[PDB]
Amino acid sequence: NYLYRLFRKSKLKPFERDISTEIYQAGNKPCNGVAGPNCYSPLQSYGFR
Amino acid sequence: TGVLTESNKKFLPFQQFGRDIADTTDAVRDPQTLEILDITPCSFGGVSV
């Protein structure tokens, strides 16, 4: 249930919250909001056991 | 440590603390009673024997 932002274009500022669930472009190719090669979701969950 | 006296300084409503020419506080505005107390250092001087 606990997720972190693995990927973002720039570092955040102090006391700023980012909740935008938009795709990140990790490569030269645009991703157009759809996952695929070199296009990953920014939010990943922790494996707490 | 100082003497608290009545003041004739027209503080603005937002303003609380005070200061002087050399950025040394000359007065304080008390929260409990909204009055301005001028702060003056206690009497002192040099002793020559």
Binding site: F15, E16, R17 | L12, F14
Partner: protein, 47 residues
Amino acid sequence: IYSKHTPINLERDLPQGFSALEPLVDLPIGINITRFQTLLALHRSYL
């Protein structure tokens, strides 16, 4: 938010001189603000 009200004659709306803006309302929001827009009032016509 800082504000000031200054009566002006029939001249350039932004006048000369100094009118310092008193700290009016310091809102504890903590949100991201990058764009803004002004709100106007309109009266219904009834015609």
